[PDB]
């Protein structure tokens, strides 16, 4: 229900406590990075495949990355 | 088109209530609907709001008045009397 727009803020809101997980759904034309905190689900719609890859890399070690 | 030879506002009562009852309520059906001059803003915008209560639409002032006419002749006599009676004893 909350979407973030800038990768730096998404990274910051996923490199925090309460980050239970990050779902990643690849669909036609885009990827969606959904991080589950306590209150709000934060979502990011990303377009560049290599940049999406860099984010995939940049998730903090430990945060369970589901791939669907 | 002229639509009523003589009835006027009392044509809504149709063929009931009697000639004189209709003819003697006509003069007050008219008055309780008529637009009366508002002395505080000079418009003709005072229309009855409730029995004895005449309010103006623009200036928001609502003024206690007669039952079917804003100014009753009795209260006109009263107002003139009260002003006279005040002024003869102020001096």
């Amino acid at each position: 229900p909350k979407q973030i727009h800038e990768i730096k803020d998404f990274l910051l809101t996923a490199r925090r406590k309460d980050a239970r997980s990050v779902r990643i759904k690849r669909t036609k034309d885009a990827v969606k990075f959904k991080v589950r905190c306590s209150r709000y689900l934060y979502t990011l719609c990303v377009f560049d495949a290599d940049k999406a890859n860099k984010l995939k890399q940049s998730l903090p070690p430990g945060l369970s990355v589901q791939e669907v | 088109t002229k639509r009523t030879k003589k009835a006027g506002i009392v044509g809504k009562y149709g063929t009931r209530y009697g000639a004189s009852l209709r003819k003697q309520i006509k003069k007050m059906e008219v008055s309780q609907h008529s637009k009366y001059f508002c002395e505080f803003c000079g418009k003709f915008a005072v229309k009855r709001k409730a029995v004895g209560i005449w309010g103006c639409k623009d200036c928001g002032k609502v003024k206690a008045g007669g039952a079917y006419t804003m100014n009753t002749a009795s209260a006109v006599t009263v107002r003139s009397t009260i002003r006279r009676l005040r002024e003869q004893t102020e001096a």
């Binding site: - | 007050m28 209560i53 206690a64």
Partner: protein, 251 residues
């Protein structure tokens, strides 16, 4: 017989006053020092139609004399009052339509309304729609005054009884024919259960002294005595005369 409607009305069962939407008691202010010995300035805020009463009520928002708060008082509107008017209360209130003065301060001939009767009982005469009392005369050797009530009677009242100068609004209301049992019904819902009113002559003897008979007639003098027991005192009570009022008797 059985108990008769004139007797059933004292029970309170269904004959109580239909007062769910009435705006409260319409009366003067609690007489105090300031309004014994000076004037208090209050401002009308609204002229509100009081259900079940033909006279409009005026919400008047005084300033409390000795505590820090407003006083929403509630008067019987005198024909002339408008929102935003300043009404002044007290003995040195100027004789203006809407102000309330003691009768020691209304010159003779003046019209007043809502006349108190014991100084501080907050208005009892000349209150219904379009009625007023004229201050006929004064007597300063006893501190009393005389008024001509609406009824044509003449009452000596204390000279310190307050009164609202002017006449009550809503006048001329009872001139309009109602023309409909519907209008009559909607009139009496908001006053009290006293309509429709059945002729006694069309009742059975067990519930009305006029009742019964192969024809409809009273059968005995319809004028009853003042002392007749409750349930017998129906008809024309203690009548001095009857028949159409002609001549001096119609005064």
């Amino acid at each position: 017989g059985r108990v008769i409607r004139a007797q059933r009305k004292g029970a309170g069962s269904v004959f109580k006053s239909h007062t769910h939407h009435r705006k409260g008691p319409a009366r003067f202010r609690s007489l105090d020092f300031g309004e014994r010995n000076g004037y208090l300035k209050g401002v009308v805020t609204d002229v509100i139609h009081d259900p079940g009463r033909g006279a409009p009520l005026a919400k008047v928002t005084f300033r409390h004399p000795f505590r820090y708060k407003h006083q929403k008082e509630l008067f019987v509107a005198a024909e002339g009052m408008y929102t935003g008017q300043f009404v002044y209360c007290g003995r040195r209130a100027t004789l203006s339509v809407g102000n309330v003065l003691p009768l020691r301060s209304v010159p003779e001939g003046g019209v007043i309304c809502n006349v108190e009767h014991h100084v501080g009982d907050r208005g009892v005469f000349a209150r219904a729609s379009g009625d007023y009392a004229i201050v006929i005369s004064h007597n300063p050797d006893n501190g009393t005054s005389r008024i001509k009530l609406p009824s044509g009677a003449k009452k000596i009242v204390p000279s310190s009884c307050r009164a609202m100068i002017g006449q009550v609004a809503g006048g001329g209301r009872t001139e309009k024919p109602m023309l409909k049992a519907g209008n009559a019904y909607h009139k009496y819902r908001v006053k009290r259960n006293s309509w429709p009113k059945v002729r006694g002559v069309a009742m059975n003897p067990v519930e009305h002294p006029h009742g019964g008979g192969n024809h409809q007639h009273i059968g005995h003098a319809s004028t009853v005595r003042r002392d007749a027991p409750p349930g017998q005192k129906v008809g024309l009570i203690a009548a001095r005369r009857t028949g159409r009022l002609r001549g001096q008797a119609a005064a």
